Short mmCIF file of C-alpha atoms in Angstrom, two decimals:
data_model
loop_
_atom_site.label_atom_id
_atom_site.label_comp_id
_atom_site.label_asym_id
_atom_site.label_seq_id
_atom_site.Cartn_x
_atom_site.Cartn_y
_atom_site.Cartn_z
CA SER A 1 26.98 15.38 7.71
CA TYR A 2 25.87 19.06 7.61
CA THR A 3 22.19 19.74 8.21
CA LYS A 4 20.15 22.05 5.97
CA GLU A 5 20.16 24.68 8.73
CA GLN A 6 23.94 24.51 9.08
CA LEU A 7 24.29 24.83 5.33
CA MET A 8 22.12 27.93 5.16
CA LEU A 9 24.08 29.42 8.10
CA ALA A 10 27.15 29.05 5.89
CA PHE A 11 25.48 30.88 3.01
CA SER A 12 24.12 33.55 5.33
CA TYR A 13 27.63 34.19 6.67
CA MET A 14 29.38 34.06 3.31
CA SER A 15 27.08 37.00 2.49
CA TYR A 16 29.13 39.13 4.85
CA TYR A 17 32.36 39.12 2.84
CA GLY A 18 33.45 42.69 2.31
CA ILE A 19 31.26 44.13 5.08
CA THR A 20 33.99 46.63 5.98
CA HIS A 21 35.36 47.23 2.48
CA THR A 22 35.24 50.96 1.78
CA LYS A 23 30.46 49.50 -5.52
CA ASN A 24 32.56 46.34 -5.74
CA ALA A 25 30.34 43.32 -6.12
CA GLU A 26 33.40 42.09 -8.00
CA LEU A 27 35.50 41.83 -4.85
CA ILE A 28 32.67 39.95 -3.12
CA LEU A 29 32.04 37.61 -6.04
CA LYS A 30 35.72 36.64 -6.07
CA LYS A 31 35.47 35.89 -2.37
CA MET A 32 32.35 33.79 -2.74
CA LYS A 33 33.90 31.58 -5.44
CA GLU A 34 36.97 30.86 -3.34
CA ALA A 35 34.73 29.99 -0.36
CA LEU A 36 32.41 27.71 -2.31
CA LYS A 37 35.64 25.86 -3.07
CA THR A 38 37.31 25.70 0.32
CA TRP A 39 34.69 25.97 3.06
CA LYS A 40 33.94 22.50 4.46
CA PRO A 41 30.12 22.74 4.14
CA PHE A 42 30.49 23.63 0.45
CA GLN A 43 32.80 20.73 -0.47
CA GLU A 44 30.10 18.06 -0.59
CA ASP A 45 28.49 19.54 -3.72
CA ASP A 46 29.28 21.89 -6.58
CA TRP A 47 27.75 25.29 -6.17
CA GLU A 48 27.59 28.13 -8.66
CA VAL A 49 26.76 31.79 -8.05
CA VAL A 50 24.16 32.39 -10.76
CA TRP A 51 22.79 35.80 -9.76
CA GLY A 52 24.55 38.63 -8.02
CA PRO A 53 26.07 39.67 -5.86
CA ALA A 54 23.81 42.70 -6.35
CA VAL A 55 24.89 45.38 -3.88
CA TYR A 56 23.10 48.43 -2.55
CA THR A 57 25.64 50.94 -1.14
CA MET A 58 26.08 54.71 -1.32
CA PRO A 59 29.01 56.76 -0.01
CA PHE A 60 28.75 58.42 3.43
CA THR A 61 26.10 56.01 4.74
CA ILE A 62 26.08 52.30 5.62
CA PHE A 63 23.05 51.78 7.84
CA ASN A 64 21.00 50.79 4.79
CA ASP A 65 23.62 48.72 3.00
CA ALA A 66 22.28 45.50 1.49
CA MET A 67 23.31 42.58 -0.68
CA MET A 68 21.61 39.60 -2.31
CA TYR A 69 22.82 36.71 -4.47
CA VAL A 70 21.54 33.32 -5.65
CA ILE A 71 23.55 30.05 -5.50
CA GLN A 72 22.51 27.10 -7.64
CA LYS A 73 23.49 23.51 -6.84
CA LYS A 74 25.27 22.07 -9.92
CA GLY A 75 23.56 19.12 -11.57
CA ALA A 76 20.49 19.33 -9.36
CA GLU A 77 17.78 20.74 -11.60
CA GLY A 78 16.01 23.71 -10.06
CA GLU A 79 17.76 23.82 -6.66
CA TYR A 80 18.52 27.37 -5.56
CA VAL A 81 19.56 29.35 -2.50
CA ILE A 82 18.74 33.09 -2.29
CA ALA A 83 20.96 34.65 0.44
CA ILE A 84 20.41 38.16 1.82
CA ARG A 85 22.64 40.51 3.81
CA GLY A 86 21.94 43.89 5.42
CA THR A 87 24.43 46.25 7.15
CA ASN A 88 27.42 45.22 9.26
CA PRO A 89 25.56 43.43 12.09
CA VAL A 90 27.94 44.12 15.01
CA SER A 91 26.79 47.69 15.60
CA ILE A 92 23.36 46.66 16.85
CA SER A 93 22.64 49.85 18.85
CA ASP A 94 23.16 51.96 15.73
CA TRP A 95 21.29 50.07 12.98
CA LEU A 96 18.65 48.48 15.24
CA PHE A 97 17.96 50.73 18.28
CA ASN A 98 18.10 53.95 16.21
CA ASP A 99 15.69 52.74 13.50
CA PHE A 100 13.15 55.57 13.00
CA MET A 101 11.35 53.58 10.32
CA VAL A 102 9.55 51.15 12.60
CA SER A 103 7.20 53.78 14.01
CA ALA A 104 5.37 54.01 10.67
CA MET A 105 3.92 50.96 8.88
CA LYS A 106 2.65 49.83 5.47
CA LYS A 107 -0.02 47.26 4.77
CA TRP A 108 1.35 44.09 3.21
CA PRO A 109 0.72 44.65 -0.49
CA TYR A 110 0.68 41.07 -1.76
CA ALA A 111 -2.19 39.43 0.14
CA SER A 112 -5.23 40.24 2.27
CA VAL A 113 -7.03 38.36 5.03
CA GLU A 114 -10.71 38.67 6.02
CA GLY A 115 -10.95 40.67 9.19
CA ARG A 116 -7.16 41.09 9.44
CA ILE A 117 -4.83 44.06 8.96
CA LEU A 118 -1.41 42.81 7.81
CA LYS A 119 1.28 45.43 8.14
CA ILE A 120 5.04 45.60 7.96
CA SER A 121 7.36 48.35 9.19
CA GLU A 122 8.37 50.89 6.57
CA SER A 123 11.85 49.84 7.58
CA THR A 124 11.44 46.33 6.15
CA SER A 125 9.15 47.67 3.40
CA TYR A 126 11.98 49.84 2.05
CA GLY A 127 14.44 47.00 2.58
CA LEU A 128 12.32 44.60 0.49
CA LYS A 129 11.76 47.22 -2.28
CA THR A 130 15.51 47.76 -2.58
CA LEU A 131 15.97 43.96 -2.98
CA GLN A 132 13.16 43.81 -5.59
CA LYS A 133 14.84 46.48 -7.66
CA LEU A 134 18.45 45.35 -7.34
CA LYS A 135 20.23 44.34 -10.55
CA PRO A 136 23.70 42.82 -10.78
CA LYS A 137 26.10 45.05 -12.70
CA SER A 138 28.14 44.21 -15.81
CA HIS A 139 30.32 41.08 -15.64
CA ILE A 140 28.39 39.91 -12.61
CA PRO A 141 26.18 36.86 -12.98
CA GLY A 142 22.54 37.75 -13.56
CA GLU A 143 23.67 41.03 -15.11
CA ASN A 144 20.86 43.59 -15.54
CA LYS A 145 17.98 41.51 -14.24
CA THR A 146 15.90 41.90 -11.08
CA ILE A 147 15.59 38.80 -8.91
CA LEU A 148 12.06 38.23 -10.20
CA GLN A 149 13.06 38.57 -13.86
CA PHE A 150 16.04 36.23 -13.28
CA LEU A 151 13.95 33.50 -11.64
CA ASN A 152 11.24 33.67 -14.30
CA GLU A 153 13.88 33.46 -17.01
CA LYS A 154 15.83 30.72 -15.28
CA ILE A 155 12.88 28.61 -14.12
CA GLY A 156 10.39 29.41 -16.88
CA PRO A 157 6.72 30.47 -16.30
CA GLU A 158 5.75 26.94 -15.19
CA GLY A 159 9.08 25.39 -14.29
CA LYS A 160 9.65 23.14 -11.32
CA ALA A 161 12.26 24.19 -8.75
CA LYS A 162 13.25 24.36 -5.12
CA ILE A 163 14.29 27.63 -3.51
CA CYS A 164 15.44 28.28 0.05
CA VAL A 165 15.71 31.95 1.07
CA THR A 166 18.13 32.56 3.92
CA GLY A 167 19.83 35.45 5.70
CA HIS A 168 21.21 36.66 9.05
CA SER A 169 20.44 39.79 11.12
CA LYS A 170 18.50 42.29 8.98
CA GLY A 171 18.90 39.51 6.40
CA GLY A 172 16.84 37.24 8.62
CA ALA A 173 13.91 39.63 8.58
CA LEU A 174 14.31 40.38 4.86
CA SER A 175 14.78 36.81 3.62
CA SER A 176 11.69 35.51 5.38
CA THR A 177 9.78 38.54 4.15
CA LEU A 178 11.12 38.12 0.60
CA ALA A 179 10.16 34.42 0.63
CA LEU A 180 6.56 35.34 1.51
CA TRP A 181 6.47 37.83 -1.36
CA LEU A 182 7.58 35.12 -3.80
CA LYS A 183 4.95 32.81 -2.29
CA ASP A 184 2.22 35.44 -2.64
CA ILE A 185 2.85 36.10 -6.33
CA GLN A 186 3.11 32.45 -7.37
CA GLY A 187 0.65 31.54 -10.10
CA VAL A 188 0.69 35.12 -11.26
CA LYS A 189 4.23 36.34 -11.70
CA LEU A 190 6.15 33.27 -10.57
CA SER A 191 5.84 29.57 -11.38
CA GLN A 192 3.49 27.80 -8.99
CA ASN A 193 5.68 24.72 -9.34
CA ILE A 194 8.46 26.03 -7.16
CA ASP A 195 8.83 24.92 -3.52
CA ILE A 196 9.70 27.94 -1.41
CA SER A 197 11.21 27.63 2.05
CA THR A 198 13.18 29.94 4.31
CA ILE A 199 15.65 29.64 7.17
CA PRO A 200 16.14 33.14 8.65
CA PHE A 201 18.66 33.64 11.45
CA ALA A 202 18.75 36.26 14.20
CA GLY A 203 16.12 38.48 12.67
CA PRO A 204 14.04 41.19 14.33
CA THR A 205 10.26 41.42 13.71
CA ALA A 206 9.44 42.51 10.17
CA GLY A 207 5.76 43.27 10.86
CA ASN A 208 2.66 42.96 13.06
CA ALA A 209 0.83 39.98 14.58
CA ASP A 210 -1.61 39.70 11.67
CA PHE A 211 1.34 39.73 9.20
CA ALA A 212 3.24 37.18 11.28
CA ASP A 213 0.17 34.94 11.64
CA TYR A 214 -0.46 35.08 7.90
CA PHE A 215 3.22 34.22 7.30
CA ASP A 216 2.98 31.20 9.65
CA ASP A 217 -0.13 29.89 7.95
CA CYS A 218 1.66 30.25 4.59
CA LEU A 219 5.11 28.76 5.24
CA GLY A 220 4.26 26.59 8.21
CA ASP A 221 6.99 23.96 8.25
CA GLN A 222 8.78 25.52 5.29
CA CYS A 223 10.17 28.15 7.68
CA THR A 224 12.72 27.37 10.38
CA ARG A 225 13.35 30.52 12.46
CA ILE A 226 16.67 30.24 14.27
CA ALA A 227 17.34 32.61 17.18
CA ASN A 228 19.92 32.54 19.98
CA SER A 229 18.17 33.14 23.34
CA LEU A 230 20.82 35.66 24.38
CA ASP A 231 20.90 37.53 21.08
CA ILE A 232 19.06 40.83 21.63
CA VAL A 233 18.22 41.46 17.93
CA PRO A 234 15.25 39.06 17.66
CA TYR A 235 13.87 40.82 20.75
CA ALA A 236 12.75 43.84 18.71
CA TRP A 237 10.18 45.08 18.24
CA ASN A 238 7.50 43.09 20.09
CA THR A 239 6.78 45.22 23.18
CA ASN A 240 7.02 42.36 25.70
CA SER A 241 10.32 41.24 24.18
CA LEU A 242 11.75 44.74 24.25
CA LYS A 243 11.17 44.91 28.01
CA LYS A 244 13.59 42.00 28.44
CA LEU A 245 16.60 43.74 26.88
CA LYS A 246 17.76 45.58 30.00
CA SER A 247 18.44 42.34 31.93
CA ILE A 248 19.07 39.81 29.17
CA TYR A 249 22.66 39.35 30.40
CA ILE A 250 21.97 39.28 34.11
CA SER A 251 22.26 35.77 35.50
CA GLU A 252 23.83 34.18 38.56
CA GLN A 253 27.01 33.46 36.61
CA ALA A 254 27.52 37.01 35.34
CA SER A 255 26.01 40.49 35.20
CA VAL A 256 26.47 42.63 32.09
CA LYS A 257 24.24 45.70 32.09
CA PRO A 258 23.43 48.31 29.40
CA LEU A 259 24.84 51.83 29.79
CA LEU A 260 22.30 54.59 30.42
CA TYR A 261 22.44 55.79 26.79
CA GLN A 262 21.25 52.34 25.71
CA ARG A 263 18.60 52.26 28.48
CA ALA A 264 17.22 55.52 27.05
CA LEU A 265 17.21 54.05 23.51
CA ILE A 266 15.41 50.92 24.74
CA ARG A 267 12.70 53.03 26.41
CA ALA A 268 12.38 55.16 23.28
CA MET A 269 11.97 51.97 21.15
CA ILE A 270 9.22 50.72 23.49
CA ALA A 271 7.52 54.10 23.40
CA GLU A 272 7.64 54.38 19.58
CA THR A 273 6.39 50.84 18.83
CA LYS A 274 3.74 50.76 21.56
CA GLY A 275 0.43 49.64 20.08
CA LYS A 276 2.05 48.48 16.84
CA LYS A 277 1.57 44.83 17.84
CA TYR A 278 4.96 43.82 16.42
CA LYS A 279 5.39 40.05 16.58
CA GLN A 280 7.89 37.36 15.63
CA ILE A 281 7.05 34.88 12.84
CA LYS A 282 7.08 31.31 14.21
CA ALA A 283 7.00 33.00 17.61
CA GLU A 284 6.66 29.71 19.49
CA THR A 285 9.83 28.28 18.02
CA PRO A 286 12.32 27.37 20.77
CA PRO A 287 15.65 29.28 20.52
CA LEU A 288 19.15 27.90 20.83
CA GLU A 289 19.95 28.37 24.53
CA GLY A 290 22.93 30.71 24.53
CA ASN A 291 25.67 31.18 27.11
CA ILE A 292 26.91 34.49 28.45
CA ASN A 293 30.59 34.99 27.55
CA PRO A 294 32.04 36.10 30.95
CA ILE A 295 35.05 37.81 29.38
CA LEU A 296 32.84 40.38 27.59
CA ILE A 297 31.56 42.64 30.35
CA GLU A 298 30.23 45.44 28.16
CA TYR A 299 26.60 45.09 27.03
CA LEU A 300 27.27 46.16 23.41
CA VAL A 301 30.28 43.84 23.15
CA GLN A 302 28.36 40.89 24.66
CA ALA A 303 25.49 41.72 22.29
CA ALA A 304 27.72 41.71 19.22
CA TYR A 305 29.22 38.39 20.28
CA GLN A 306 25.88 36.70 20.79
CA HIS A 307 24.55 38.04 17.48
CA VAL A 308 27.49 37.19 15.28
CA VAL A 309 29.61 34.60 17.02
CA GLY A 310 26.70 32.95 18.82
CA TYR A 311 25.12 31.18 15.87
CA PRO A 312 28.14 29.36 14.42
CA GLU A 313 29.11 28.50 17.98
CA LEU A 314 25.80 27.08 19.20
CA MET A 315 25.45 25.19 15.92
CA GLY A 316 28.86 23.52 15.97
CA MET A 317 30.16 25.52 13.03
CA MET A 318 33.08 27.34 14.65
CA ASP A 319 35.62 25.31 12.71
CA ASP A 320 33.45 25.54 9.61
CA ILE A 321 32.81 29.30 9.20
CA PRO A 322 35.94 31.58 9.01
CA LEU A 323 34.69 34.50 11.05
CA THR A 324 37.98 36.41 11.22
CA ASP A 325 38.33 36.08 7.47
CA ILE A 326 34.82 37.37 6.86
CA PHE A 327 34.58 40.17 9.42
CA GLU A 328 38.25 40.94 9.79
CA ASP A 329 38.56 43.74 12.27
CA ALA A 330 34.83 43.98 12.58
CA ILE A 331 35.25 41.22 15.14
CA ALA A 332 37.82 43.45 16.86
CA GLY A 333 38.17 41.76 20.23
CA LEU A 334 34.97 39.75 20.34
CA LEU A 335 36.95 36.55 19.76
#
C-alpha cells in the first residue's frame, strides 16, 4: 500500500522528533520507538532502531544541528535505512540564505574523474564530516561506533545487504552525499555486496556540476530526488535556480512576494555562488507540482509551508505523518 518513497518520507520526518527540545538522544529514541509502533506506514513490518540516534548539538547555536540513525527491518537479512536530519527546517532564510560556507569549496575526496573537477561546498563537507564522526552515546543503540564501524561490524567485510539513505531539507543534501561516500569506498572500507540507494527530499545543491554528474552516473536509478516545485530550498545554489526565488509564489491565483531583506539576501547568494557551477543531482527529475496556499501571504511563511507541509501533502501522507506531534509549535500557524 505505501510506496518506497512514501516510506522513506516517513523515516525522514520521524527524524525531526525533538527539533525544538532545548544532548538527549534518549528523548528522541523513545519517540522513535513509539512511532515505529503506531505510525501507519510502520505497521506493515517490524522495525528496529539499531544505530543512533547520534546527535550533534551544542548550546547557544542550532544552525548546525544534525542527527542520524539507522533502522533495520526485522527478519529481513541486511535491510537497512539510514535517515539524516539537519537543523529545524522551517527557518529557511536563516539556515539556508545566510550560509557563508557555500562560497568556498572542497574537492570531493573519495573519487576522481578524468578531465573533471568534482567539488562540494564546505558547508556540506563539514556536514558530512560531522556525520562520519558521530557516535551514539551510552545506552543508545550502536553505542560508541561511527556509522562506518557499525556497518562493517553489522554487515561484515563481505556481507550482503541493502541500504537506503534518506533525509529531508539539509538531510536531503547530506543523505545523498553520504550515500555516494559509502558507494565510493565500497570494496575498500565497505562490503561491495551491499546495494546502496538514496531517496533525498527537498535538498539544496551539495556541490558542482561535475560532482552532480559523477553522482548521477554512480547512483543512476538508485537515486530518486523528490522536490516540490514551490519549495524554495532545492532552488539553491544553482545560479539560474536562485534567480527564480523572487517570483516563485507569483501566479494568477495569488501573489506572495519576498520582503526587501530577503531580496537582498537572494542577491547576495547569487553574487557569492556566481561561477561556482552549483547544480542539482538528478537535475532533470520532474518535481511534484505544488500549490500555493492562499491563506499564507508572507513569503517566509509560504516557504516554510511548502518545505515542510508540502511533501506529506503532495504525497498523500497527511493522515500518515503527525506533523503537529513532530514539530509542535514549530508549525506555529502554518497549518
